[PDB]
Design an enzyme around this catalytic site. Structure first.
Site, short mmCIF file in Angstrom:
data_model
loop_
_atom_site.label_atom_id
_atom_site.label_comp_id
_atom_site.label_asym_id
_atom_site.label_seq_id
_atom_site.Cartn_x
_atom_site.Cartn_y
_atom_site.Cartn_z
CB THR A 118 4.19 25.30 6.90
OG1 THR A 118 5.32 24.43 6.68
CG2 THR A 118 2.96 24.63 6.31
CE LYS A 143 3.64 27.43 -0.17
NZ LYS A 143 4.40 28.33 -1.05
CD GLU A 187 9.56 10.37 -1.26
OE1 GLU A 187 10.57 10.80 -1.86
OE2 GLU A 187 8.53 10.05 -1.86
CG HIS A 205 11.10 14.35 13.10
ND1 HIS A 205 11.16 15.56 12.46
CD2 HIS A 205 10.62 13.48 12.17
CE1 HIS A 205 10.74 15.39 11.23
NE2 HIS A 205 10.41 14.14 11.02
CG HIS A 206 10.84 9.86 11.00
ND1 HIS A 206 9.54 9.48 10.73
CD2 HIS A 206 11.06 10.98 10.27
CE1 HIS A 206 9.03 10.38 9.88
NE2 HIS A 206 9.93 11.29 9.58
CB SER A 239 0.16 28.76 -5.38
OG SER A 239 0.90 28.50 -4.19
NE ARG A 284 2.64 3.28 11.66
CZ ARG A 284 3.54 3.85 10.86
NH1 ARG A 284 4.44 4.70 11.36
NH2 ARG A 284 3.53 3.58 9.56
CE1 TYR A 320 7.29 18.87 5.07
CE2 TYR A 320 9.61 18.92 5.51
CZ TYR A 320 8.34 19.01 5.96
OH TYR A 320 8.18 19.11 7.32
CB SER A 331 12.63 6.48 -12.62
OG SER A 331 11.52 7.32 -12.91
CB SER A 332 12.72 10.03 -8.83
OG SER A 332 11.43 9.43 -8.91
CD1 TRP A 378 6.26 3.39 5.40
CD2 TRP A 378 7.44 4.26 3.71
NE1 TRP A 378 6.52 4.71 5.70
CE2 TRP A 378 7.25 5.26 4.68
CE3 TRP A 378 8.17 4.58 2.56
CZ2 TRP A 378 7.76 6.56 4.54
CZ3 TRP A 378 8.67 5.88 2.42
CH2 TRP A 378 8.47 6.85 3.40
CG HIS A 382 -1.64 1.36 1.56
ND1 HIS A 382 -2.68 1.97 0.82
CD2 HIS A 382 -1.42 2.12 2.77
CE1 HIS A 382 -3.02 3.05 1.61
NE2 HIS A 382 -2.36 3.15 2.73
CG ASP A 410 9.91 18.53 -25.22
OD1 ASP A 410 10.51 17.78 -24.42
OD2 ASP A 410 8.83 18.21 -25.75
CG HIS A 437 11.41 14.92 7.11
ND1 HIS A 437 10.38 14.66 7.97
CD2 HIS A 437 11.21 16.13 6.55
CE1 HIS A 437 9.58 15.71 7.90
NE2 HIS A 437 10.04 16.62 7.06
C1 HEA Z 1 3.17 15.12 2.71
C2 HEA Z 1 3.25 14.51 3.88
C3 HEA Z 1 3.70 15.01 5.21
C4 HEA Z 1 3.93 16.30 5.59
C5 HEA Z 1 3.86 17.57 4.78
C6 HEA Z 1 4.41 16.20 6.97
C7 HEA Z 1 4.66 17.28 7.78
C8 HEA Z 1 5.06 17.23 9.10
N1 HEA Z 1 5.24 16.07 9.84
FE1 HEA Z 1 5.07 14.19 9.21
N2 HEA Z 1 4.76 12.37 8.64
C9 HEA Z 1 4.32 11.95 7.43
C10 HEA Z 1 3.87 12.78 6.41
C11 HEA Z 1 4.01 14.15 6.35
N3 HEA Z 1 4.48 14.88 7.41
C12 HEA Z 1 4.51 10.47 7.26
C13 HEA Z 1 4.35 9.61 5.98
C14 HEA Z 1 4.91 10.04 8.48
C15 HEA Z 1 5.11 8.62 8.93
C16 HEA Z 1 6.20 7.81 8.29
C17 HEA Z 1 6.43 6.53 9.01
O1 HEA Z 1 7.10 6.56 10.07
O2 HEA Z 1 5.92 5.50 8.52
C18 HEA Z 1 5.09 11.20 9.33
C19 HEA Z 1 5.64 11.13 10.63
C20 HEA Z 1 5.97 12.21 11.44
C21 HEA Z 1 6.67 12.18 12.73
C22 HEA Z 1 7.09 10.97 13.59
C23 HEA Z 1 5.97 10.13 14.23
C24 HEA Z 1 6.47 8.86 14.91
O3 HEA Z 1 6.77 8.94 16.13
O4 HEA Z 1 6.54 7.79 14.25
C25 HEA Z 1 6.83 13.44 13.06
C26 HEA Z 1 7.42 13.91 14.20
O5 HEA Z 1 8.11 14.91 14.19
C27 HEA Z 1 6.18 14.27 12.07
C28 HEA Z 1 6.05 15.68 12.10
C29 HEA Z 1 5.66 16.52 11.06
C30 HEA Z 1 5.78 17.96 11.09
C31 HEA Z 1 6.32 18.80 12.21
C32 HEA Z 1 5.35 18.41 9.88
C33 HEA Z 1 5.18 19.84 9.44
O6 HEA Z 1 5.52 19.99 8.05
C34 HEA Z 1 3.79 20.44 9.62
C35 HEA Z 1 3.68 21.90 9.19
C36 HEA Z 1 2.25 22.39 9.11
C37 HEA Z 1 1.73 23.20 10.03
C38 HEA Z 1 2.49 23.47 11.29
C39 HEA Z 1 0.38 23.80 9.87
C40 HEA Z 1 0.34 25.05 9.02
C41 HEA Z 1 1.05 26.24 9.68
C42 HEA Z 1 0.43 27.16 10.46
C43 HEA Z 1 -1.05 27.34 10.46
C44 HEA Z 1 1.28 28.10 11.31
C45 HEA Z 1 0.86 28.28 12.77
C46 HEA Z 1 0.97 26.98 13.54
C47 HEA Z 1 1.75 26.75 14.61
C48 HEA Z 1 2.45 27.89 15.29
C49 HEA Z 1 1.96 25.32 15.12
N4 HEA Z 1 5.73 13.52 11.03
C1 HEA Z 2 0.05 8.74 -0.97
C2 HEA Z 2 -0.04 8.27 0.29
C3 HEA Z 2 -1.14 7.39 0.83
C4 HEA Z 2 -2.47 7.56 0.65
C5 HEA Z 2 -3.08 8.57 -0.30
C6 HEA Z 2 -3.17 6.62 1.54
C7 HEA Z 2 -4.50 6.33 1.51
C8 HEA Z 2 -5.08 5.34 2.28
N1 HEA Z 2 -4.40 4.61 3.30
FE1 HEA Z 2 -2.55 4.62 3.81
N2 HEA Z 2 -0.63 4.51 4.20
C9 HEA Z 2 0.39 5.12 3.51
C10 HEA Z 2 0.22 5.91 2.37
C11 HEA Z 2 -1.00 6.33 1.82
N3 HEA Z 2 -2.25 5.89 2.31
C12 HEA Z 2 1.69 4.85 4.12
C13 HEA Z 2 3.02 5.48 3.77
C14 HEA Z 2 1.49 4.01 5.17
C15 HEA Z 2 2.58 3.42 6.08
C16 HEA Z 2 2.81 1.92 5.85
C17 HEA Z 2 3.63 1.27 6.95
O1 HEA Z 2 3.17 1.32 8.11
O2 HEA Z 2 4.71 0.70 6.64
C18 HEA Z 2 0.04 3.82 5.25
C19 HEA Z 2 -0.60 3.06 6.22
C20 HEA Z 2 -1.97 2.89 6.26
C21 HEA Z 2 -2.68 2.34 7.34
C22 HEA Z 2 -2.09 1.77 8.64
C23 HEA Z 2 -1.91 0.24 8.66
C24 HEA Z 2 -1.16 -0.20 9.89
O3 HEA Z 2 -0.16 0.48 10.23
O4 HEA Z 2 -1.58 -1.20 10.52
C25 HEA Z 2 -4.00 2.35 6.98
C26 HEA Z 2 -5.05 1.82 7.72
O5 HEA Z 2 -6.12 2.34 7.72
C27 HEA Z 2 -4.10 2.95 5.70
C28 HEA Z 2 -5.26 3.19 5.04
C29 HEA Z 2 -5.40 3.99 3.96
C30 HEA Z 2 -6.67 4.31 3.42
C31 HEA Z 2 -7.95 3.86 4.06
C32 HEA Z 2 -6.53 5.11 2.36
C33 HEA Z 2 -7.63 5.75 1.65
O6 HEA Z 2 -7.78 7.14 2.01
C34 HEA Z 2 -7.48 5.70 0.15
C35 HEA Z 2 -8.46 6.59 -0.57
C36 HEA Z 2 -8.16 6.45 -2.04
C37 HEA Z 2 -7.48 7.42 -2.68
C38 HEA Z 2 -7.35 8.79 -2.11
C39 HEA Z 2 -6.78 7.20 -3.99
C40 HEA Z 2 -7.64 7.88 -5.01
C41 HEA Z 2 -6.68 8.70 -5.80
C42 HEA Z 2 -6.31 8.25 -7.00
C43 HEA Z 2 -6.57 6.84 -7.33
C44 HEA Z 2 -5.66 9.07 -8.11
C45 HEA Z 2 -6.50 8.93 -9.37
C46 HEA Z 2 -5.75 9.51 -10.55
C47 HEA Z 2 -6.11 10.57 -11.29
C48 HEA Z 2 -7.25 11.46 -10.87
C49 HEA Z 2 -5.38 10.94 -12.56
N4 HEA Z 2 -2.87 3.37 5.27
CU LIG Z 3 9.70 13.38 9.12
#
Ligand code: HEA
Ligand code: HEA
Ligand SMILES: [Cu+2]
Ligand SMILES: [Cu+2]
Ligand SMILES: [Cu+2]
Ligand SMILES: [Mg+2]
Lengths: 47, 84, 75, 514, 261, 227, 56, 75, 84
Positions: free
Chosen positions: D316, D319, D242, D290-291, D255, D438, D244, D156-157, D126, D61, D91, D240
């Site tokens: 953030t 924005k 990744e 932080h992970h 935007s 989890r 962003y 590729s990327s 993952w 997934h 292009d 991480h």
């Molecule tokens: C696109 C996806 C995405 C984005 C953008 C972010 C953004 C952030 N994530 Fe992440 N995060 C994930 C996807 C993402 N994350 C994933 C996939 C994992 C789990 C991976 C795994 O372990 O499997 C994860 C896990 C994860 C962890 C670890 C959890 C653990 O213990 O396993 C942490 C901890 O620091 C964290 C923090 C944050 C923070 C601080 C931001 C910041 O970027 C947030 C910034 C946004 C705001 C803050 C809100 C907007 C701003 C304002 C309105 C300003 C005013 C607000 C304040 C003054 C607070 N994330």
């Molecule tokens: C892109 C990131 C992504 C997205 C979008 C989602 C979407 C979904 N994921 Fe998630 N999920 C992950 C990335 C993602 N997930 C990752 C990184 C983990 C961590 C794995 C790990 O623990 O190792 C995770 C783990 C995870 C868990 C935790 C399992 C566990 O730890 O035991 C669960 C359980 O509910 C879950 C559920 C779902 C569900 C219900 C959706 C639903 O919201 C899905 C809804 C469907 C969609 C939003 C897709 C539709 C969009 C398209 C098909 C695009 C179509 C194309 C065009 C329009 C051109 N996901």
């Molecule tokens: Cu992180």
């Protein structure tokens, strides 16, 4: 470039017949959604 | 510990002025705060007449000839011991 | 015992550390056998060596330093 | 002919279309996998079986949605389609290489599919952390195939990252400065840089993992003096950036969408917006640990990483507030895309706010490895990255195709998906605060209510992605050709009509040097 | 329209990307066969189609630039950027390996003897052949520079002479390094020291071979008068890559061969 | 442990867990403030026919919205860091227990004096006696003295595992070849449940932790009857 | 030595409506087909191996 | 003796070296008191500590290593 | 350990060709001699079955699956002990 241009011509699949298209989209997205189900099945039938 | 980041291929004065106020100065502000927060006043270190310290082979060319230049009595003892 | 033998960890013209190390070692062992009793066992070897290699004046001053508590080494 | 056009391409538009097609299909597979996950957790007990078959599903997934749906669509699809059009380029810099980037994807996907077929697949998560990913606890070709799939996807990327940076820097009109290119272009130019610097470290990490299990090395094996934690550092150093890399192109599309439907010429605070992404991209490189809060690191360093992670909220924030300021005096048009843009702005805020909570090591001790973190990232991914993809897709579909979508249907689709994702992930905040770990195929009886509600929401989402497929079919079945487009003065992509011809900007664009 | 008025290059449809993508599939899955079901036939085919692809893809690039004249100034500036960027991703690839090394050597686990180098490992002497390999690489740095300068001054014979000297030093290092491997009293399997050593110095080794075949290609292109005193990017790149290679060796030497041993 | 339909954290059995609840409340109060502020501004923006599509001056307001978030972050950071150090604090334990994660069970070792060591396995839902918790009961509870500072040392003998006990606010990964330390200190007697907090294979969900805290007296007699 | 880039420039600039990877003759063509053949076959062979390894 | 006390030289979450150091220390002291007699004095402290902190399996394997002479630490 | 030396302000190909044959190559010759003189053949190290060495968790993909790639029997023992 003998590459045709315009709506319905800048894609790798024919959009001229809506029902042939229906079939194609159905197999395309359909086969994609079914794959995980059949993989799980395959894993469940091993030993 | 970084690697690098946002490339903006064309660097002119606008780019350097951008880095100045958008990176350089903000860092000086953060670190300033950091150093303003970690401003823990250490209690003057325990005096022990170690021979490899408070060296004196010739009296300094100033004052009573026993006081180092930027002498801080709070944290700098004389050879004999802390000032007062 | 004739004299301090060749020491692989001190293979060069400079023996300063050789003298230093054994002086520490001895006094460190001494302090332990004291604060443990263990039948007040004794680490003579180190003293034989350090006495042979260390010039008198160093040993003397170090002992004094250890007396007034201004000895820089950690024992 | 078809071959030459579709297999031997050198056209940014066609390669971009090929991506969107790959991403949509991969999106089906990932959706199916997410449903098996909630199917298994929707009733106390075991449906599939042991955490192995279950975790194999959870792993695929993640890989599928991250590497095969989100990245291909946003960067390869919209990236290739729109970038050249927005800067007036004929292009890309390397048309051929660009094609390899795409064609490396299907094979990469095959290797990943193959991994779950041979043996018992890869039930490693993952993060594919060792010792579980090692040749003892996971003997067989599976993990190796998972690793090779990742190698290709990475090659590729970074090849594409090389193309976008070169194009974007080197192929704009001579009078146009970088501070004259649109936010989306900036968004992908910055994302491209993150890929260039993070992807290689991952490849260094998994190559070390590959040798550890086939060549008798002990990089992560204590026996030989290795360290399972070393893998965590390498992985997360990429891990991480990744995420962003996953949200930045989304920031850009947002935007563009918010500005367009607000009837504005440009977004509020353009240079603040450029500064924000650049800061986000940079801080994103110094916070990986932080992970690893519960791994046994020094309190001091643990303190550094919680602080460093928190300052990302500032940029953030500028924005979020800028997009709001953009809506300000606007003449709002309640189009489907605008609906997706608004949802993103809120939902992404909530999900990132929830991430600030996890930023705290102390609190993260009890929050780590629980469903709270599953909620955090699904908010920012399912209703952040994905909402941007949908808004961008419905907004630019006419440009790509020449045909229009049925707006009412398109709005129905938002309504359904908005309900679905919230119902799915909202409860999960509780399950996590209350302790549900989890990667479990089953849970103690207490967690039954929320897990039930949660799974029901996933079925509504299923309904929505089914309807979307139809919505695309109908658009192509009816054939309403585009006539007029608004605000083209400030939106170059539309100046060549829908769809733009195979060859655009054959004769450049005239831009004065004031 | 019809006739373009921009200085860019619209490359003709090539089957090579597909061919090279398929190659990657074959080599990766082929390694999986070798590693697991003990077979190389697949790995062999992949290596084959891969060379075929690279040969042709690069042959065309030469055709398009030297024979067809598509490499206008704008096109070239773009190639420079591409190379720089590529070298960068490489620099970060090697960084994973120095991270690994330092991680291990700075905090040696007890299973090693709680020291570095681990007990039982007999490190090579930096002052022997490692010192030689260092001077060889460094000299080819000065000779490739001489080559570059002759080329810009239109001195055909000298550019050829310097490019030749440079190439042989690169080969000399390869052989020398090869023997070191064979005489080394430790192996990939000797815990973390062997892992850390053989994969870092090993990947670098692969890079010296990749850089040498590149300079060789440059050699022949010159024999055939491909390069003009002013347009020779193929050489500029070969040269940049070659320097990246000395530099990586300098870090290897100092870190692994000297400090961590 | 966790009860049906629970919303927040499990009740704090130890003082740092209490400390955390309060910090979370603080942090959560703020996320409610910001998340509701944003929602209000959004609805505000979308609710007027009045337009102003010409150019608007940025920067001016840009400071407010950059300095404010900066102050708020300190308000969270301070409390956070204090608790952080408070956890890694200089304490002197009166007991040291070791736990070793294994593929699908934990084993404990009390070895300060005598070499006491046992295995803790989950009770199959099939052989549970009425009133016993489905996936949480273990056969051999880890008995420890209430009201005392214990030092836990977590490690593993195979893959990675994570030893956690939410009520006490503990979670420490178990990495082979490593000895991670943590301070346990319950301020009340009882049974306290936890689960493996790290993916470790087929039975990852079926290798729980059950702490049973009784007074010293009963602790030592238990310890002896255990060998 | 030689220097006949001038002949090749002409050969490759010749308006025969051929793509650069074929503009050079018959060998270009055989090389192409060989490469294409090996790739497709290999790909087929690989799929067979995977189908084979999928089973216990 | 209750249990191994806090050790300043090992102030963090990772105690691996704490266990390791004392195991060495003890066996190093043991060997000396043996090859010196010194009334066969004994370094129990180190053994109390290392037994408390080191998981059984490590001590066991180390002892075996010391038996066959494949123990990597220098005693 | 040097600092630098003879400046020749104008660098063209003649200068680099001068450095090549007047510095670069002569060094490669000296070091070659040095390494040809210090060619002391070390007697194969004493074998002791340390567990952190001669690691084997999966037989190598070649030969008898117990022989490392550039295996030199003279100086590389098998896990069991020296080859012969
Ligand atoms: C696109 C996806 C995405 C984005 C953008 C972010 C953004 C952030 N994530 Fe992440 N995060 C994930 C996807 C993402 N994350 C994933 C996939 C994992 C789990 C991976 C795994 O372990 O499997 C994860 C896990 C994860 C962890 C670890 C959890 C653990 O213990 O396993 C942490 C901890 O620091 C964290 C923090 C944050 C923070 C601080 C931001 C910041 O970027 C947030 C910034 C946004 C705001 C803050 C809100 C907007 C701003 C304002 C309105 C300003 C005013 C607000 C304040 C003054 C607070 N994330
Ligand atoms: C892109 C990131 C992504 C997205 C979008 C989602 C979407 C979904 N994921 Fe998630 N999920 C992950 C990335 C993602 N997930 C990752 C990184 C983990 C961590 C794995 C790990 O623990 O190792 C995770 C783990 C995870 C868990 C935790 C399992 C566990 O730890 O035991 C669960 C359980 O509910 C879950 C559920 C779902 C569900 C219900 C959706 C639903 O919201 C899905 C809804 C469907 C969609 C939003 C897709 C539709 C969009 C398209 C098909 C695009 C179509 C194309 C065009 C329009 C051109 N996901
Ligand atoms: Cu992180
Ligand atoms: Cu476990
Ligand atoms: Cu587990
Ligand atoms: Mg974890």
């Amino acid at each position: 470039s003998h590459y045709e241009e315009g709506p319905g011509k800048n894609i790798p699949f024919s959009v001229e017949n809506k029902w042939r298209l229906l079939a194609m989209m159905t197999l395309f997205f359909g086969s994609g959604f079914a794959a995980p189900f059949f993989i799980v099945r395959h894993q469940l039938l091993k030993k | 510990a970084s690697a690098a980041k946002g490339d903006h291929g064309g660097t002119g004065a606008r780019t350097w002025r951008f880095l100045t106020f958008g990176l350089a100065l903000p860092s000086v502000a953060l670190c300033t705060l950091n150093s303003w927060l970690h401003s823990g006043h250490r209690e003057r270190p325990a005096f022990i007449p170690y021979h490899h310290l408070r060296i004196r082979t010739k009296p300094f060319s100033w004052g009573d000839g026993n006081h180092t230049f930027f002498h801080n009595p709070r944290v700098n003892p004389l050879p004999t011991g802390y000032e007062k | 015992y004739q004299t301090a033998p060749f020491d692989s960890r001190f293979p060069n013209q400079n023996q300063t550390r050789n003298c230093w190390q054994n002086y520490l070692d001895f006094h460190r062992c001494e302090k332990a056998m004291t604060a443990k009793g263990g039948d007040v066992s004794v680490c003579e070897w180190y003293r034989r060596v350090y006495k042979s290699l260390c010039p008198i004046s160093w040993v003397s001053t170090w002992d004094d330093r250890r007396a007034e508590g201004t000895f820089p080494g950690k024992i | 002919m078809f071959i030459n056009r579709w297999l031997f391409s050198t056209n940014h538009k066609d390669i971009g279309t090929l991506y969107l097609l790959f991403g949509a299909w991969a999106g089906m597979v990932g959706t199916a996998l997410s449903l098996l996950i909630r199917a298994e957790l929707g009733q106390p007990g075991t449906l599939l079986g042991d955490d192995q078959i279950y975790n194999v599903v959870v792993t695929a997934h993640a890989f599928v949605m991250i590497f095969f749906m989100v990245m291909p669509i946003m960067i390869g699809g919209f990236g290739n389609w729109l970038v050249p059009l927005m800067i007036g380029a004929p292009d890309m810099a390397f048309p051929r290489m660009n094609n390899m980037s795409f064609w490396l994807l299907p094979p990469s996907f095959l290797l990943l599919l193959a991994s779950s077929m041979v043996e018992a697949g890869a039930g490693t998560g993952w993060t594919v952390y060792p010792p579980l990913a090692g040749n003892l606890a996971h003997a067989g070709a599976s993990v190796d195939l998972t690793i090779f799939s990742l190698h290709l996807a990475g090659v590729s990327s970074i090849l594409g990252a090389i193309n976008f940076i070169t194009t974007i820097i080197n192929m704009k009109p001579p009078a146009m400065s970088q501070y004259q290119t649109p936010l989306f272009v900036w968004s992908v130019m910055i994302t491209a840089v993150l890929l260039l610097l993070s992807l290689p470290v991952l490849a260094a990490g998994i190559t070390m993992l590959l040798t550890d299990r086939n060549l008798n090395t002990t990089f992560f094996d204590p026996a030989g003096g290795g360290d399972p934690i070393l893998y965590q550092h390498l992985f997360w150093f990429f891990g991480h950036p990744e995420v962003y890399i996953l949200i930045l192109p989304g920031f850009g599309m947002i935007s563009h969408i918010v500005t367009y439907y607000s009837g504005k010429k440009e977004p509020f605070g353009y240079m603040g917006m450029v500064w924000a992404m650049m800061s986000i991209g940079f801080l994103g490189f110094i916070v990986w640990a932080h992970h690893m809060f519960t791994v046994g690191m020094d309190v001091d360093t643990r303190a550094y990483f919680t602080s460093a992670t928190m300052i990302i909220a500032i940029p953030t924030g500028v924005k979020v507030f800028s997009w709001l300021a953009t809506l300000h005096g606007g003449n709002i048009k309640w189009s489907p895309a605008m609906m997706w843009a608004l949802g993103f702005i809120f939902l992404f805020t909530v999900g990132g706010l929830t991430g600030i909570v996890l930023a705290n090591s102390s609190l993260d001790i009890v929050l780590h490895d629980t469903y709270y973190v599953v909620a955090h990232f699904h908010y920012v991914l399912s209703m952040g990255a994905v909402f941007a993809i949908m808004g961008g897709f419905v907004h630019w579909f006419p440009l790509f195709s020449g045909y229009t979508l049925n707006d009412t249907w398109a709005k129905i689709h938002f309504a359904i998906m908005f309900v679905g994702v919230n119902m799915t992930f909202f409860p999960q905040h509780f399950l996590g605060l209350s302790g549900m770990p989890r990667r479990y195929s089953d849970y103690p009886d207490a967690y039954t209510m929320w897990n039930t509600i949660s799974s029901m929401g996933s079925f509504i989402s299923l309904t929505a992605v089914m309807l979307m497929v139809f919505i695309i079919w109908e658009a192509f079945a009816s054939k309403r050709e585009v006539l007029t487009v608004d605000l083209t003065t400030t939106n170059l992509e539309w100046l060549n009509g829908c769809p733009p011809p195979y060859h655009t900007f054959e004769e450049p664009t005239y831009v004065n040097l004031k | 329209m019809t006739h373009q008025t921009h200085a860019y290059h619209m490359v003709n449809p090539s089957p090579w990307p597909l061919t090279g993508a398929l190659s990657a599939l074959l080599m990766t899955s082929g390694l999986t066969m070798w590693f697991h079901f003990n077979s190389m036939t697949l790995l062999m085919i992949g290596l084959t189609t891969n060379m075929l692809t690279m040969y042709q893809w690069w042959r065309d690039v030469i055709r398009e630039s030297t024979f067809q004249g598509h490499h206008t100034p704008a096109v070239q500036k773009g190639l420079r950027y591409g190379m720089i960027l590529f070298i960068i991703s490489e620099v970060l690839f090697f960084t994973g390996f120095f991270w690994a090394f330092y991680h291990s050597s700075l905090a040696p686990t007890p299973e090693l003897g709680g020291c570095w180098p681990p007990t039982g490992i007999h490190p090579l002497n930096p002052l022997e052949v490692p010192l030689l390999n260092t001077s060889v690489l460094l000299a080819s740095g000065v000779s490739i520079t001489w080559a570059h300068h002759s080329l810009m001054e239109g001195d055909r014979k000298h550019m050829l002479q310097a490019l030749f000297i440079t190439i042989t030093l690169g080969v000399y290092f390869t052989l020398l390094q090869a023997s070191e491997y064979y005489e080394a009293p430790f192996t990939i399997s000797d815990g973390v020291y062997g892992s850390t050593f053989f994969v870092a110095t090993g990947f670098h080794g692969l890079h010296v071979i990749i850089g040498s075949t590149f300079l060789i290609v440059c050699f022949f292109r010159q024999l055939k008068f491909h390069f003009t005193s002013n347009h020779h990017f193929g050489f500029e790149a070969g040269a940049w890559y070659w320097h990246f290679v000395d530099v990586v060796w300098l870090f290897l030497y100092v870190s692994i061969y000297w400090w961590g041993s | 442990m966790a009860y049906p339909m629970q919303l927040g954290f499990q009740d704090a059995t130890s003082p740092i867990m209490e400390e955390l609840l309060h910090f979370h409340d603080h942090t959560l109060m703020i996320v409610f403030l910001i998340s509701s502020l944003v929602l209000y501004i959004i609805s505000l923006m979308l609710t007027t026919k009045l337009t102003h599509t010409s150019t608007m001056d940025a920067q001016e307001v840009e400071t407010i919205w950059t300095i404010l978030p900066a102050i708020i972050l300190i308000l969270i950071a301070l409390p956070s860091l204090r608790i952080l150090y408070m956890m890694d604090e200089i304490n002197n334990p009166s007991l040291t227990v070791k736990t070793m994660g294994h593929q699908w069970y934990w084993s404990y070792e009390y070895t300060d004096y005598e070499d006491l060591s046992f295995d803790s396995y989950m009770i199959p839902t099939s052989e549970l006696k009425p009133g016993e918790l489905r996936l949480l009961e273990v056969d051999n509870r880890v008995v420890l003295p209430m009201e005392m500072t214990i030092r836990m040392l977590v490690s593993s003998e195979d893959v990675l595992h994570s030893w956690a006990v939410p009520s006490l606010g503990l979670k420490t990964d178990a990495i082979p070849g490593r000895l991670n330390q943590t301070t346990l200190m319950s301020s009340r007697p009882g049974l306290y449940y936890g689960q493996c907090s790290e993916i470790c294979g087929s039975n990852h969900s079926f290798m729980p932790i059950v702490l049973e805290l009784v007074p010293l007296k009963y602790f030592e007699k238990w310890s002896a009857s255990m060998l | 030595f030689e220097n006949r880039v001038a002949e090749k420039q002409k050969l490759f600039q010749e308006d025969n409506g051929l793509p650069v990877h074929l503009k050079g003759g018959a060998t270009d063509n055989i090389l192409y087909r060989v490469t294409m053949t090996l790739c497709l076959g290999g790909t087929l062979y690989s799929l067979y191996c995977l189908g084979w390894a999928s089973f216990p």
